[PDB]
Amino acid sequence: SLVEQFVFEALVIYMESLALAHADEKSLGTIQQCCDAIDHLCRIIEKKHVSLNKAKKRRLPRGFPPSASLCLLDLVKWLLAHCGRPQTECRHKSIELFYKFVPLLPGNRSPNLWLKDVLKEEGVSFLINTFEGGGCGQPSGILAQPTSLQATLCWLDLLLAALECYNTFIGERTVGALQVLGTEAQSSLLKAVAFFLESIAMHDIIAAEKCFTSPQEGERYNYSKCT
């Protein structure tokens, strides 16, 4: 009865909690606990899914802008929206979970071709949603050209989340590179390419910003650079 009333709520709550984990000290084991939690979540979902397959009105998930009888695909597409998010590992586990949930979906269960089905209408919106970042599109990347350190770090987070989303998609073979590159080509990709000549491996202390080691935490900046 409780899961019949509570599956998506706690799931999105844990998503957000781990997102907060990205927002602070990320080395603590709380991330492992959330990972184990969502493992339990996917384990019960794969154990019990037919209720999710039907639109069953549960408690509204905290992250759920609409309001209707909740279905599996509801939160499936909701999580799909929550990709490219500036929580690189939260986004990574999210996309891997969704990938393992395509079998759970009542549509193209075995085929990844459900992504192809949504691609027909969403030919380009994956650039603005699945690859939302880089510069949140462009805009976060243009400010990175004249340039704080925290802004640098969050921009790197967004860019790397988008890049890893690209890599996961292409290596999954669930999407073609020509579909994502050359048709919905992202300027942020080559902007980062240029930024490599700008700051990566030669500006190991600055980003040609002139606007601001431990007094400047160049260690974590370098950690991000190597990442």
Q: Which method was it determined by? A: cryo-EM
Cited resolution, angstroms: 4.5
CA–CA–CA angle 51, 19, 68 (5° rounding): 35
* DSSP reduced 3-state for 160: helix
The candidate with the shortest Cα–Cα distance to 152, out of 197, 208, 215, is: 208
Compute the distance between CA of residue 136 and CA of residue 191 in angstroms, rounded to an integer.
Answer: 12
**Do 28 and 82 meet the contact criterion of CB atoms below 8 Å apart?**
no
What residues have CB less than 8 Å from 179, skipping those under 6 apart? 119
Compute the distance between CA of residue 195 and CA of residue 201 in angstroms, rounded to an integer.
Answer: 10
Angle between helices 149-171 and 187-198 (to 10 degrees): 130
Q: Is 151 exposed, middle or buried (0-12, 13-18, 19+ CB in 10 A)?
A: middle
DSSP 103: T
CA–CA–CA angle 38, 41, 42 (5° rounding): 95
